[PDB]
Design a protein around this ligand. Structure first.
Ligand code: B12
Ligand SMILES: [Cl-]
Length: 414
């Protein structure tokens, strides 16, 4: 397929996999990541005996956290439960090991996911006013995860996603847009291939064409679909063909070229990003989880085991931190070694000054939730920008500021 990546340098692929490798040893509840496991299984690489151990740890964690103790011992909280979107990714990890969800525990998890989607459908409502409590991204992911296990949702559930894709100047905010379209597209694709909602067949077919149209519309002059980090998900979808056009073929050539050029510059550091990219580089997508091949050999991944000693005096950078959207504005000047993350900078400011911040765990790493005591509310988030007004494309743990940058933390409501 013209949208498939064929010409990748194997040593670049190995380098990407090597970044995932140490995560295979990070087995705590808040570090376990079903997306990383899926990513490796659909790649051309393997982390040996570490993989099965990782999946056993996922099985233990998700099952014990999400299932039972009915009369919960004086708390109603303490454990750090995975979310329902995270449960969907867990269902994808099972498929990646060529398993179907089964037994009583399995049926219980399936019910919890179906209930999540039903609660989301009702939050949307009558089709008009109402957003999901989470996102259309997670809604799409839930449908897809049930679908690859051959579990059906009601026509009305699929209907809310179809409507969201269909109706006018579209619902989707710019940040989520390409990624959500790609994930919606993959759900539709699974539903079409599996014939789970036959009464919606034609509507699903048309929505698939519409998703492709919107993704192409979002191609940047560089050739990314949306941005570099949404390009792997979009290519996961577009490799699934359907409607081959010359416009699509041309778009895909530009996108693969842009993605390849970006890989030459160590662009992908975030494990979750790598996990979405590795399948594309092996001509696979989440839709392949309908009938996975666990018999196909993968190349063994070994660590670097070297680590570069300069024995030097490092270059320093001067950065200005700024906080806006709260009543008294805050600014902080720090000088740090070149290569320090924004997270390091925030920790430095908290240590050597009156800055304070809090994060919560996510599959993408530390998510910024509070700044100077102000926790982000219900439909609010702490947006991270390079001044002026340019939202960053990496989170706090991965963004490495350059000399003389002013970074802004802005409480916004989207
Ligand atoms: C929906 C979404 C959001 C929502 C999430 C809130 C909501 N109502 O759900 C909002 C709008 C708040 C958001 C914010 C941001 N996002 Co966002 N987001 C997504 C999206 C579309 C889906 C995430 C999801 O639900 N995944 C599934 C569930 C099961 O996973 P999860 O880990 O449990 O989900 C949580 C995290 O993803 C977290 N989150 C969302 N975005 C980001 C980004 C980072 C870096 C981290 C650590 C966490 C995080 O919110 C989710 C819980 O609500 C992804 C797309 C993708 N390809 O993954 C982008 C994506 C993860 N976001 C991205 C970015 C860059 C950001 C921001 C840094 C943008 C900015 N400059 O402020 C901020 C985060 C800043 C912060 N406060 O730490 C990038 C990350 C790229 C990279 N190199 O890692 C992605 C890949 C999109 C893209 N193509 O650029 N995001
Ligand atoms: Cl990254």
């Amino acid at each position: 397929n013209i949208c498939e990546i064929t010409e990748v340098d194997s040593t670049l692929v190995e380098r990407l996999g090597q970044r995932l490798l140490p995560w295979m040893d990070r087995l705590s509840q808040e570090q376990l990541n079903p997306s990383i496991y899926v990513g490796l299984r659909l790649s051309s690489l393997q982390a040996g005996a570490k993989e099965a151990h990782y999946l056993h740890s996922l099985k233990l964690s998700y099952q014990q956290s999400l299932l039972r103790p009915a009369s919960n011992k004086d708390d109603n909280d303490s454990e750090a439960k995975p979310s329902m979107g995270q449960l969907a990714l867990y269902l994808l990890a099972l498929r990646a090991n060529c398993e179907f969800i089964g037994g009583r525990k399995g049926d219980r998890l399936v019910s919890q996911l179906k209930r999540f989607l039903e609660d989301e459908k009702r939050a949307i409502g009558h089709n008009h006013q109402g957003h999901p409590r989470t996102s259309y991204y997670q809604y799409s992911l839930g449908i897809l995860a049930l679908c690859v296990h051959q579990k059906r949702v009601h026509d009305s559930v699929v209907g809310k996603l179809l409507y969201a894709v269909e109706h006018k100047p579209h619902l989707l905010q710019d940040h989520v847009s390409v990624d959500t379209m790609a994930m919606a597209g993959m759900a539709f694709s699974c539903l079409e291939l599996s014939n789970l909602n036959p009464k919606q067949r034609n509507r699903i077919n048309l929505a698939l064409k519409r998703v492709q149209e919107k993704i192409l519309k979002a191609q940047t002059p560089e050739g990314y679909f949306g941005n570099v980090y949404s390009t792997p998900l979009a290519l996961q979808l577009l490799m699934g063909s359907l409607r081959p056009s010359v416009e699509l073929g041309t778009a895909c050539l530009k996108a693969k070229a842009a993605l390849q050029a970006s890989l030459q510059h160590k662009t992908f550091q975030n494990p979750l990003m790598i996990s979405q990219l590795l399948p594309v580089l092996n001509q696979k997508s989440y839709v392949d989880l309908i009938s996975p091949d666990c018999q196909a050999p993968r190349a063994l991944l070994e660590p670097a085991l070297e680590t570069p000693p300069q024995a030097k005096v490092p270059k320093f950078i001067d950065v200005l931190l700024k906080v806006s959207g709260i009543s008294p504005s805050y600014r902080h000047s720090v000088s740090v070694p070149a290569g320090s993350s924004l997270e390091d900078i925030l920790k430095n400011a908290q240590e050597h000054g009156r800055f304070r911040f809090r994060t919560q765990a996510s599959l993408s790493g530390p998510f910024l939730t509070s700044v100077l005591g102000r926790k982000a509310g219900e439909r609010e988030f702490w947006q991270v920008l390079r001044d002026p007004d340019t939202p960053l494309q990496q989170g706090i743990a991965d963004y490495r500021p350059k000399d003389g940058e002013t970074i802004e933390l802005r409480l916004v409501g989207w």
